[PDB]
Amino acid sequence: LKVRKYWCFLLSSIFTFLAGLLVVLLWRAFAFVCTFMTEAKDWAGELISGQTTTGRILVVLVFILSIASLIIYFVDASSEEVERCQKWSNNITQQIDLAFNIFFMVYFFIRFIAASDKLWFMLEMYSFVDYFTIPPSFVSIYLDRTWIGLRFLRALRLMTVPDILQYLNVLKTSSSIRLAQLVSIFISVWLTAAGIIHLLENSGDPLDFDNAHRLSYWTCVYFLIVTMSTVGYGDVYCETVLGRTFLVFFLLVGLAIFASCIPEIID
């Protein structure tokens, strides 16, 4: 590590995330005083309202490969280095993750090109993740260096997993679907929070970059499972100041979220 470089990697993520804040808010509202229309009808069924093949085929290739993208993220997550340099020509998995995202960042185009809401679609949960993960795809192509990245946020795609189960008629009853929903967010939130813990601890504080503790993703999931259960063995704990701030916040928001829906619908 010569000089910090994730700041511009996040700035590239910031650039694209704030690009929608500028390219959309400046153009949409000017036409009130005085194709997009045809493809929107297809896209509504091509992505959401598909019954047999218009939507299901497209849906299958976005979450299965996202899980595959998560799997190939684990092999670099288990790596000791947080920002490693390697020749991206013929690696085992460096080509696939970019290749998977090649038809994922044009996949987001079909959502953005024919979005019913041009402004409200900016903060949608599934589109929010991509804006923080699509520019990382461009990161590893112009400087030959790849890091842990924000690709752990792809675990939020697990919240769509029960939706496909409805398509395959695995869970026909509505009661089973409702309980299958809650377990999906529970796993997705648990895994995506472990990725934040992994990043906030291995990378270290941006100021000193010396108080970095080596923690594995297999340890991070074990870290949060005992925290949610309020056991607290203490054998593993967060040392980074930035990481400690997350534990204060996430417990507070987690307890409030846990005590907002589970006591009323789980009971």
Residue 41 binding target from another protein, K ion, none, CB below 5 to 8 Å by type: another protein
Residue among 14 and 251 whose Cβ is closer to another protein: 251
Q: How far is the CB of 171 from another protein (least distance, A)?
A: 12
**Rounded to an integer, what distance in angstroms lies between the CA atom of residue 34 and that of residue 18?**
28
The residue (of 136 and 243) whose beta carbon lies closer to another protein is: 243
| Region from 41-49, 107-115, 157-165, 197-205 binding another protein, contact rule CB under 8 A | 41-49
Secondary structure element (H or E) that encloses residue 128, with its range: helix 125-131
* Spatial separation of the C-alpha atoms in residues 194 and 155, rounded to whole Å: 10
Amino acid in position 231 = V
Question: Which residue lies nearer to K ion by CB, 138 or 237?
Answer: 237
With CA atoms as reference, report the closest residue to 43 among 35, 52, 32. 35
Q: 192 to 231, contacts with another protein by CB under 8 A?
A: 227, 230-231
For residue 253, state whether it binds another protein (rule: CB under 8 A): no
Q: Count CA atoms closer than 13 A to 178's CA, side-chain side.
A: 7
Residue 103 CB partners (closer than 8 Å, separation 6+): none
Residue 85 to residue 12: CA distance in whole angstroms = 19
Out of 145, 179, 237, 242, the residue judged to bind another protein by CB under 8 A:
237
> In the chain, where do the E strands start and end?
83-85, 145-147
Of residues 163 through 182, those in contact with another protein by CB under 8 A are 173-175
* 144/239 with CB nearer another protein: 239
Of the candidates 180, 125, 181, the one whose C-alpha atom is nearest the C-alpha of residue 153 is 125
Tell me which residues touch K ion (CB under 5 A): 232
Q: How far is the CB of 116 from another protein (least distance, A)?
A: 10
Please give the residue ranges that form the binding site for another protein (CB under 8 A).
41, 44, 49, 173-175, 227, 230-232, 234, 237, 239, 241, 244-245, 247-248, 251-252, 255, 259-260, 263-264
